RNA sequence: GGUUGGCGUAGGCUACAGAGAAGCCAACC
């Protein structure tokens, strides 16, 4: 497995020792392992925040501030999704980010890399305030409009004649507290993750989990149809993909595809669909 | 191709909300 072919971290992992020598705010959070190598404890929210903020500055020229009480996005995963959206839409382009988080990372990356315009929505006060500040401090307010909404949905007032090229979304993966704790395992001694989940409740849980959340997005798409060229959603769980493709098929959606986002050990998936007859459909990963 | 059971990440491996994932084994259709 490999990251997306255009992902700048493919076969080029960041050099933590180089980053620590150049960025004192990163060096503050590193550890030295028993090989004498600069390393990170990815279970420490401050360390992973420092890494993400430092990568965005050094590699993308973006300065962001984010809280420890909300999700800390990881750059290679988010880039894998941006590059897949480039493939979908055939890369002025306009997108919608549903639930943009405190980092506003998808709009910041898309506007910086490709000059895309974004409508970026958020339901959480803390995430909304940080997202607005991160857009403003990177001088991207002309390209990115951050809006506070009551629900994560495509059926918004901010939408009437502008046709969007795409939507993207990181849906809340989990339906309940046992799922969010990761304890639904065959064996109690299953190794724990190397990461930590700092997400807020509206970032990580939803009624019915990502399966029911994405079904609601699908039913929103059945009302909007051609208002957006491509609909897309990340999936945190492999077992969500088949039931969601079958929901699209039962509802008669003509064009459907999917992909895998590969980075580290944690895989993510994503689903995309369209009602247009013109668009080319990117192939899913080979069998 | 599929279904079911078993195994599978403790970072002396640079993560990616670990998805029991990537994989591996057996058996049955």
For residue A257, what are the β-bridge partners? A272
Name the nucleotide with the smallest C1'–CA separation from A184. Answer: B20
Alpha-carbon distances of A48 from A13, A73, A74, A173, A242, rounded to whole Å? 15, 9, 8, 20, 32
Nearest residue: Cα versus C1' of B16 = A74
Q: Which range marks the domain in which residue A86 is found?
A: 16-274
**What does the radius of gyration of chain A's CA atoms come to, in whole angstroms?**
19
Nearest residue: Cα versus C1' of B15 = A42
- Residue A9 inside a domain? The answer is no
For chain A, the domain total comes to 1
- Residue A154 inside a domain? The answer is yes
The spacing between the Cα labelled CA in A151 and the C1' in B15, in angstroms, equals: 31
Q: How many CB atoms lie within 10 A of CB A73?
A: 21
Tell me which residue of A223, A230, A225, A222 sits closest to A271, measured CA to CA: A230
Instruction: Give the angle subtended at the CA of A122 by the CAs of A211 and A86, to the nearest 5°.
Output: 70
Instruction: Give the angle subtended at the CA of A254 by the CAs of A173 and A4, to the nearest 5°.
Output: 50
- Residue A285 inside a domain? The answer is no
Tell me which residue of A1, A5, A92 sits closest to A282, measured CA to CA: A5
| CATH number for the domain that contains residue A144 | 3.40.50.150
- Residue A284 inside a domain? The answer is no
Bridge-based pairing of strands A228-235 and A267-274 is antiparallel
Contact status, residue A17 vs residue A38, Cβ threshold 8 Å: yes
The spacing between the Cα labelled CA in A166 and the C1' in B18, in angstroms, equals: 28
Give me the helix-helix angle, A241-250 and A209-224, nearest 10°.
30
The sign of the dihedral angle between the CA atoms of A273, A197, A73, A97 is positive
Q: What DSSP string describes A145-185?
A: EEEE-SSSSS--TT---PPEEEEEE----BSSHHHHHT---
Residue A122 assigned ligand-binding role: yes
Tell me which residue of A279, A239, A282 sits closest to A257, measured CA to CA: A282
- Residue A3 inside a domain? The answer is no
- Residue A166 inside a domain? The answer is yes
- Residue A283 inside a domain? The answer is no
Q: Which residues contact A208 (CB under 8 A, 6 or more apart)?
A: A175, A215
Tell me which residue of A268, A213, A277, A211 sits closest to A244, measured CA to CA: A211
Q: Which residues contact A275 (CB under 8 A, 6 or more apart)?
A: A221, A225, A226, A253, A254, A255
The spacing between the Cα labelled CA in A28 and the C1' in B28, in angstroms, equals: 57
Q: Which residues contact A157 (CB under 8 A, 6 or more apart)?
A: none
Q: Per this entry, what is the length of chain A?
A: 287
- Residue A29 inside a domain? The answer is yes
Burial class (CB in 10 A: 0-12, 13-18, 19+), A249: exposed
């Amino acid at each position: 497995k490999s990251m997306h072919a255009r992902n700048r971290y493919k076969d080029k992992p960041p050099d933590f020792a180089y980053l620590a020598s150049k960025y004192p705010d990163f060096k503050q959070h590193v550890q030295i392992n028993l090989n004498g190598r600069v390393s990170l404890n990815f279970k420490d929210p401050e360390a992973v925040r420092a890494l993400t903020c430092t990568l965005l500055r050094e590699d993308f020229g973006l300065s962001i501030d984010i809280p420890l009480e909300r999700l800390i996005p990881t750059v290679p995963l988010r880039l894998n999704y941006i590059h897949w959206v480039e493939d979908l839409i055939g890369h002025l382009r306009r997108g919608i980010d549903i639930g943009t988080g405190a980092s506003c990372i998808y709009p910041l990356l898309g506007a910086t890399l490709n000059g895309w315009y974004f409508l970026a929505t958020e339901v959480d006060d803390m995430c909304f305030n940080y997202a607005k500040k991160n857009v403003e401090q990177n001088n991207l307010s002309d390209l990115i409009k951050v809006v506070k909404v009551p629900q994560k949905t495509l059926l918004m007032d901010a939408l009437s004649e502008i046709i969007y090229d795409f939507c993207m979304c990181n849906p809340p993966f989990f339906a309940n507290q046992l799922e969010a704790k990761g304890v639904n395992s065959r064996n109690p001694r299953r190794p724990p993750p190397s990461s930590v989940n700092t997400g807020g409740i509206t970032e990580i849980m939803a009624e019915g989990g990502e399966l029911e959340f994405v079904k609601r997005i699908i039913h929103d798409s059945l009302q909007l149809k051609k208002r957006l060229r491509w609909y897309s959603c990340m999936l945190g769980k492999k077992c969500s993909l088949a039931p969601l493709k079958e929901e699209l098929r039962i509802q008669g959606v003509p064009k459907v595809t999917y992909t895998e986002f590969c980075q580290g050990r944690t895989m993510r998936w994503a689903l995309a669909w369209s009602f247009y007859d013109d668009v080319t459909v990117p192939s899913p990963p080979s069998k």
